[PDB]
Amino acid sequence: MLDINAFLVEKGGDPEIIKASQKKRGDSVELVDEIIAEYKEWVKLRFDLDEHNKKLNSVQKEIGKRFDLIAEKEKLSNEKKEIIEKEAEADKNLRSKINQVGNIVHESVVDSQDEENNELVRTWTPENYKKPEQIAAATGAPAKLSHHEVLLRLDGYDPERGVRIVGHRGYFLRNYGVFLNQALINYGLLFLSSKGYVPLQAPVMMNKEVMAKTAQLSQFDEELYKVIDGEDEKYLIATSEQPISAYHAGEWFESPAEQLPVRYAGYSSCFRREAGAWGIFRVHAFEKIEQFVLTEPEKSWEEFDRMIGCSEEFYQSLGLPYRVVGIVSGELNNAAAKKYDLEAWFPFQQEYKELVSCSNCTDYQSRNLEIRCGIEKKYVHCLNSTLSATERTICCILENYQKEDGLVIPEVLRKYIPGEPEFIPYIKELPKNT
Amino acid sequence: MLDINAFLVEKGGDPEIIKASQKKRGDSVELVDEIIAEYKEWVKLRFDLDEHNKKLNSVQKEIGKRFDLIAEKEKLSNEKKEIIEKEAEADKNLRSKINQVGNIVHESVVDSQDEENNELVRTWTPENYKKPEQIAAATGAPAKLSHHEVLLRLDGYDPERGVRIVGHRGYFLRNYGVFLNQALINYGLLFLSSKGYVPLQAPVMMNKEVMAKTAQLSQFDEELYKVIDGEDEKYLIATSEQPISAYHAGEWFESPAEQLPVRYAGYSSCFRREAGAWGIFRVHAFEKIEQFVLTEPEKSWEEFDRMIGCSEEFYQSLGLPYRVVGIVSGELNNAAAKKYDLEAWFPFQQEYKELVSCSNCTDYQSRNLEIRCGIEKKYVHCLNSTLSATERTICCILENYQKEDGLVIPEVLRKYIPGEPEFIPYIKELPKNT
């Protein structure tokens, strides 16, 4: 969340800047004024408390000199009890309100509630692909089949037995489906580590209290599965960004010039209660390689560019056309000050679909997790960016690498697959011949 | 579970054989007699029902001829209602009792409640390792460090941040920890597929009703995490054997000579509520490559040998000494008719520790899942055997590949690791120097 002092002009803050940000987000502006007011009640309480302490010590010294005053003592004391309780209430209410206020929207971000206004940052195409159309980019073939249809014809997954065993959108991966998923995971880890990222495989369960410090309210009552562990409860993570963001909680980069940046290639499975048609594009459980980076506050915008640059390079290496768009303010989650999505071309769908989101969260989370930077307190900046949601990335590959008789295996992935096939044939026909 | 007719001498069964098996298991013998008795009540009810139907049709024809009897009609009808209800009760009670009876213990199995009597099936050592002692098998070095200590010194995992984020035995894998885990997964999938297994990555959530058909009672109120999904509940799997066993539920191998055997190289993460000291040897979440095989009933014992033979070859290829032991009857779970464990030598621990269990479950599960075989009904046999519990397998590797300054990377794993290192140095010292 934001620093309390950010709301307070007497402590160098600028609440107008917060109101402007709130408005760009399409969130509550009045929340700022409530916060300022609640803070004043807390301050009033603290003074009354401060005054009671001084009065109590003073009156006890008078009682001492007597070797009626005592009646006043019990009175100040009973009032102090109330004040202490009220102060705690005010502090609690203040913090819960502050918790509702989103990170300051960066000035570069487009101010709008309508994604039609997303900024078009850049467009990339493989050199033999003239422009985005209904043509598989890597093969030049008609993009005849959707990703789920290519995957069905390859016998690369099982949604039907999947649905029977775990319900809606459940799936097994089969054969080359398995090999392609692993290929992306391992190619992804190799790609980031060669760029100095530290591979980090995160646990997929998290204690409630840690999760609450890194993920926003909406995330719980909607996105996360709860786990019952006898009498205890944990959450399944939606992304390794959650546990990895907390990896350095309560730590201090006291020599940041030398110690930062820290870059993690996070890997884990991911679980989302909200998913949605057919296929492995939007499902409840999937794997992801995630970039998570801590930097000095002064260096995060530059890092942001480097990180989206890593993802771009990655997709280029897979030969997948894409565009990068700057998400409008009304669509940023609370922590993000700025967000770029890389959206790759799906030639059957004939549309760009999101494969990567990259966000600079400045010190919004690090403030909560108490991750300090250097010598009020100064915190690191935290950034996160998808490298690959692997099943979804497989979907993009399926559409762009299809041809009449099967699937060309992206060259960079071949070494990761037994036999290093350059091509794998369709095994099955669809109930819809043409 | 066993066929009902197995309990019934009039239907060719042999309840004495079931009692003998129960006794070997150290489970209830009287359960058999209860089952036989409950079955007789069900039969008595069915006859009374059968008799009422015939009486009802007969008496209605007399009522028809009248163009008092009607009073008798309403009476037979009210009795029929009761009988129908009782029959259903008897059937329910019968089935729940049958469900408690374990699979028939195979004659080769040692009859004992004490694992000291496990059969010693075979022993294998790498050719330059004379005998099991406190020496790292692959390097000949003193087995100075336990697996967790080697992993700490390599900076290959993080139990401390792990514990903070997800609690007891929580861990991140780091760097080479990640690469070693993936190496085993991919080496494992390649190893089984080259032997004709089909790679199958299973979902890690299962609907309650399917899980109950494949896993025994004890497994729920003890082993499995429950997942809350709004108003619904699912389980996290303890092993891909669970969902994969149900993969062919309700299917029929009508031409088994040609269609069987079916062999799956299952891959998934695994979750167990019961785990336990320090390290990644016994933890709540880990990955496993599992063999799961369906065969004709006549071929399963031969398959059992082939499957343990696959695991043996696998460990040999990793250069890890081991023994194979035949688990005593009192230690078999309900489904297993026979079980072999491969237990690998841990030179620091100076003991053999279980890495693989391989079981022939004959048709105990397939009967429940209705997986028929060929032209009462005949079902396939189901067998399951660990190939590698990967984190635990890493532990064995750590102890056997350690030397004074770091870890030798098992040759077969090298190609799966960036840089294909032959050796990786210790990065960290332990708080206990010597």
UniProtKB/Swiss-Prot annotation, chains A, B:
One of its GO terms (molecular function) is serine-tRNA ligase activity. It is an enzyme of class 6 (ligase). Pfam families: Seryl_tRNA_N (PF02403), tRNA-synt_2b (PF00587). Transmembrane segments: none annotated. Keywords: Aminoacyl-tRNA synthetase, ATP-binding, Cytoplasm, Ligase, Nucleotide-binding, Protein biosynthesis. SUPFAM superfamilies: Class II aaRS and biotin synthetases, tRNA-binding arm. GO terms for biological process: cytoplasmic translation; seryl-tRNA aminoacylation. InterPro entries: aa-tRNA-synt_IIb, aa-tRNA-synth_II, aa-tRNA-synth_II/BPL/LPL, Ser-tRNA-ligase_type_1, Ser-tRNA-synth_1_N, SerRS_1_N_sf, SerRS_core, tRNA-bd_arm. It catalyses: tRNA(Ser) + L-serine + ATP = L-seryl-tRNA(Ser) + AMP + diphosphate + H(+). Homodimer. The tRNA molecule binds across the dimer. Consists of two distinct domains, a catalytic core and a N-terminal extension that is involved in tRNA binding. NCBIfam families: serS. This is Serine--tRNA ligase, cytoplasmic. It comes from Candida albicans (strain SC5314 / ATCC MYA-2876).
